[PDB]
Amino acid sequence: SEISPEQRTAFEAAVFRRLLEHLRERSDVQNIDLMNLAGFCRNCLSNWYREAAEASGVPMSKEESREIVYGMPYEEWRTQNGEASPEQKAAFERN
Amino acid sequence: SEISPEQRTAFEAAVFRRLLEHLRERSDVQNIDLMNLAGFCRNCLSNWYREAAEASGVPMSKEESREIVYGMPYEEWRT
Amino acid sequence: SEISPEQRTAFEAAVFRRLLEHLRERSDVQNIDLMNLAGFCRNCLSNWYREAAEASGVPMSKEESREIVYGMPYEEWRT
Amino acid sequence: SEISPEQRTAFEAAVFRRLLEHLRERSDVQNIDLMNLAGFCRNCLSNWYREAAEASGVPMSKEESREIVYGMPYEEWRTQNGEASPEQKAAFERN
Ligand SMILES: [Mg+2]
Ligand SMILES: [Mg+2]
Ligand SMILES: [Mg+2]
Ligand SMILES: [Mg+2]
């Protein structure tokens, strides 16, 4: 019921980590499609996180913030691109 | 690294609040299309937030979580 | 095993149609609660069906897929 | 647009395989909770699949149909039960 500002922040951070989980398992969900649809993507998330750290006095590169959001160097992730969609796996890769 | 657990929490929470704000301004983006593309929507966000509070020992209703994500009662947003 | 690819297709399709039928009769179960519990709902089913048709070379609209899953126009079900 | 009965069946089977994927990745989603909520679970799916095979003249045990739905012997799956929820992983297993 009655929650502290430290609880609100803990719940925001944790829900953010749930989102990150989720975008990592929906590796098929393209950033451009996210961009086109929703005006953000995993890159906007990395940038906003960078902005937050820089405002807190923590210097951080584009690629450091991306490793945080992606869970691996962004290069390791986007070269793990080339792969069938969930609906194409289901259609052709099973029976 | 040199970034403590509590710095991460700060940055993760700020980024979440910025997402929330950005979804409030992109009110033209339908939960349905977010769901069909990405497998989550504003209702999933409210659900994950509620589940986070529960996981931390704080019970919370479906409507409380939605108030938080939407920045208003859900039914007022539904308009 | 002794069960061919085409037997599987038969059985998988029949089980899907039985699920569909069972969700039509459990119209008291809200898409929202299905979504918050299981991470899918009747709208995800319609979306997956549309994506299956697309994956097979057949374009299909959001409303066509929903007609199939709901057994009626979505808006008529929304009532 | 205009689709054959063989296409309808192919799309039903494939959407069923997408569901099965999904329930396998949401291994945290309990059958009882599914039962309580929705009047079905992964066991009802196994049973219906069994009924369909038996009607097609294919004998199949309770446990064979379950291996089909679960993707592994049901024993290997339910002993891989005891594990933190997604929200508890996010809360306590990260920073
Ligand atoms: Mg972006
Ligand atoms: Mg959702
Ligand atoms: Mg859904
Ligand atoms: Mg059941």
Provide CB contacts within 8 A for D69, sequence distance 6+: D20, D23, D42, D45, D46, D49
Q: Is the dihedral of CA C53, A81, A31, C41 positive or negative?
A: positive
What is the distance of C-alpha A82 from the center of its chain?
19
CA distance B12 to A16: 6
- Please report residues of C whose CB lies closer than 8 A to that of D15: 16, 45, 48-49, 52
Judge: domain C1-79, CATH 1.10.630.10. Answer: no
Nearest to C65 by CA among C79, C35, C44, C36: C44
CA distance C44 to B34: 11
CA atoms lying within 13 Å on the CB side of residue C40: 21
CA distance B22 to B17: 9
CA distance C46 to C72: 12
Residue C70 region by backbone torsions, left for phi larger than 0, else alpha for psi between -120 and 50, else beta: alpha
First to last CA, chain B: 45
Provide CB contacts within 8 A for D43, sequence distance 6+: D31, D66
**Which two tokens mark B76?**
């007022």
Query: Do C55 and A85 lie within an 8 Å CB cutoff?
Result: yes
Query: Do C55 and A95 lie within an 8 Å CB cutoff?
Result: no
Nearest to B49 by CA among B27, B16, B77, B72: B16
* Residue entry with tokens 């396998």: D24
Q: Considering CB atoms only, which of C34, C39, C49 is closest to D11?
A: C49
Q: What is the 3-state secondary structure (H, E, C) of chain B?
A: CCCCHHHHHHHHHHHHHHHHHHHHHCCCCCHHHHHHHHCCCHHHHHHHHHHHHHHCCCCCCHHHHHHHHHCCCHHHHCC
Selected from 3.30.420.40, 2.60.40.10, 3.40.109.10, 1.10.3340.10, the CATH number assigned to the domain covering D1-95 reads 1.10.3340.10
Alpha helices in D39-85 (DSSP H): 42-55, 62-70, 74-79
**Which two tokens mark B37?**
């593309």
What is the distance of C-alpha C12 from the center of its chain?
12
Query: Do A56 and B7 lie within an 8 Å CB cutoff?
Result: yes
CA atoms lying within 13 Å on the CB side of residue C26: 20
CA distance A76 to A16: 22
A60: helix, coil or strand? coil
**Which two tokens mark A32?**
């451009």
**Which two tokens mark C36?**
């918050």
DSSP track, A21-38: HHHHH-TTS-HHHHHHHH
CA distance A44 to chain D (A): 21
Q: Any idea where the domains of chain D sit in the sequence?
A: 1-95
CA distance B25 to D1: 36
Provide long-range contacts, Cβ within 8 A and 24+ apart, for A23-26. Answer: A23/A69, A23/B38, A24/A70, A24/A71, A25/D25, A26/B38, A26/B39
CA distance A30 to A20: 14
**Which two tokens mark D55?**
């009607």
Q: Is the dihedral of CA D77, D78, D82, D87 positive or negative?
A: positive
Q: Considering CB atoms only, which of A1, A13, A29 is closest to B12?
A: A13
